[PDB]
């Protein structure tokens, strides 16, 4: 009974996340077809994505619960189509800000994809199904990245046709979305945990690490363009992004497989991984070699996945399936608030308006500071 909804949802997720154009956005936005500057991209366009995502998170969380998840998934597909149509045929900074708003809407509506399974699949099949819905999606992204590189290097395709392929993929995903079964019920509408100190502590670290990770991901490509201009040197953004995603997945799988007492070693290992993330970011900032910056990105992604897997495991050790949704919603909202504060202060034109050449110094300092503060409280 679960096979049909599971298969349709996994097909939708795979085709929605298969986007060969994603790895090559900055070379595309700054290329001769859009002619946008790196300052405009980093300090005027990209920040909007956070703002909308913060604004649309809670409403969409409640809409998704009230109007059941299928409508929200269809809305996400429509948003994908509109976003990629505007990316393909949009021109100027204002159109790009609208594109960022719609992509933030897509990110906010992504919650329905992972909450849909609960209302259709029996509790018995939750775990495995979730795993599938996760595995598939990750593979899709990796596949797209690899394909992009294989098309950029061997097929000598243009960034425009990568966006065309992404548009076709999202259109197919939306068509698949139109065939998901209607959920009959919902967790909250159609049916105090933070008191525990451990839950609060682990959620705080999860939120801060997630904010840092998402801030670094939004501008890693701009940093790469700064170090290795795409208009004069060969770039390997697809291969690097595929390898980094694979390393992160392997790190998460290793965390899952190995059994160790995280109640005691968790703080030590998490501090060590935060220090490694800070060191990798410092290497990306200081190093003038592009290969060193790729290696730093790989290390940062793998270590952050090592971190977040343990954090999520510790948060979710005693939480129920129903409470997962609200706890993780609150944690992602707080992470978005932190990321929005950081963007307003640092990246936004109304703050320091720092270029990408100084932003990663701030990000490395941010991770080092998280590690330093959390190391405290040992004595006294």
């Amino acid at each position: 009974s679960w096979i049909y909804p599971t298969v349709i949802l996994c097909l939708f997720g795979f085709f929605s996340m298969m986007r060969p154009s994603e790895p090559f956005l900055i070379p595309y936005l700054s290329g001769p077809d859009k002619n946008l500057t790196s300052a405009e991209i980093t300090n005027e366009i990209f920040p909007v994505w956070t703002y909308s995502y913060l604004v649309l998170l809670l409403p969409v969380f409640v809409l998704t619960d009230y109007v059941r998840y299928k409508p929200v998934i269809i809305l996400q597909g429509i948003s994908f189509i509109i976003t990629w149509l505007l990316l393909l045929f949009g021109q100027g900074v204002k159109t790009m800000q609208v594109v960022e708003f719609f992509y933030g809407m897509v990110t906010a509506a992504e919650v329905a994809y992972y909450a849909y399974i609960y209302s259709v699949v029996s509790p018995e099949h939750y775990q495995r199904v979730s795993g599938y819905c996760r595995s598939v999606t990750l593979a899709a992204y990796t596949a797209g990245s690899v394909l992009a590189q294989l098309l950029v290097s061997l097929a000598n395709m243009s960034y425009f046709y990568l966006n065309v392929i992404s548009l076709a993929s999202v259109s197919v995903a939306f068509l698949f979305s139109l065939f998901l079964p209607m959920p009959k019920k919902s967790m909250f509408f159609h049916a105090e945990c933070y008191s525990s100190k451990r839950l609060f502590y682990w959620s705080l670290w999860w939120a801060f690490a997630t904010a840092g990770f998402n801030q670094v991901l939004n501008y890693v490509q701009i940093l790469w363009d700064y170090k290795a201009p795409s208009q004069d040197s060969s770039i390997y953004n697809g291969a690097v992004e595929a390898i980094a995603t694979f390393g992160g997945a392997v790190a998460a799988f290793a965390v899952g497989y190995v059994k160790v007492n995280w109640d005691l070693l968790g703080e030590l290992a998490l501090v060590v991984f935060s220090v490694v993330n800070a060191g990798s970011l410092f290497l990306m900032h200081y190093t003038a070699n592009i290969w060193a910056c790729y290696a730093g990105y790989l290390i940062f992604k793998s270590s952050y996945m090592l971190l977040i897997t343990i954090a999520v495991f510790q948060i979710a050790v005693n939480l129920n399936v129903e409470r997962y949704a609200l706890v993780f919603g609150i944690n992602t909202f707080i992470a978005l608030v932190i990321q929005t504060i950081m963007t307003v202060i640092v990246v936004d034109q109304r703050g320091l308006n720092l270029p990408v050449s100084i932003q990663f110094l701030v990000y490395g300092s941010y991770f080092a500071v998280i590690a330093g503060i959390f190391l405290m409280r040992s004595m006294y």
Partner: nanobody
Framework: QVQLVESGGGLVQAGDSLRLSCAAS????????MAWFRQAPGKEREFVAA????????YYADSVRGRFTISKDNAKNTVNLRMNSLKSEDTAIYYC???????????????????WGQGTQVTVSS
């Protein structure tokens, strides 16, 4: 006191190119935003393109994006603006303005800049 002086503007047949230069004097200019605005009769002052001297960051308006390029020639404390494929819609008076770099600086807002040139007129004839 800062003094911005513009040169280069003139009568150019539509479709050609033209280079405008704004030289700033009276101070050491290393931490200023240098921007170009334009104003046409019966219209308001419009942002054209800005450059961050310290970092070299550049911003353009969508109307002139892809055609106008703003650079800096520090050897003479000048900021240049090269305009290619000029159209009749580019006829205006161009003012170069200088703003002090600082927290929360709105690059595209004319009120942000406290130093303005006398303006050089660029007329495009079809």
């Amino acid at each position: 006191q800062v003094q911005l002086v513009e040169s280069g503007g003139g009568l150019v047949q539509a479709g050609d190119s033209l280079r405008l230069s704004c030289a700033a004097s009276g101070r050491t200019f290393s931490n200023y935003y240098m921007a170009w605005f334009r104003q046409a009769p019966g219209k308001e002052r419009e942002f054209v393109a800005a450059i961050r001297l310290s970092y070299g960051s550049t911003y353009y308006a969508d109307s002139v994006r892809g055609r106008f390029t703003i650079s800096k020639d520090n050897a003479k404390n000048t900021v240049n603006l090269r305009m290619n494929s000029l159209k009749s819609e580019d006829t205006a008076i161009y003012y170069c303005a200088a703003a002090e770099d600082r927290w929360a600086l709105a690059v595209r807002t004319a009120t942000t800049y406290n130093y303005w040139g006398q303006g050089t007129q660029v007329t495009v004839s079809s």
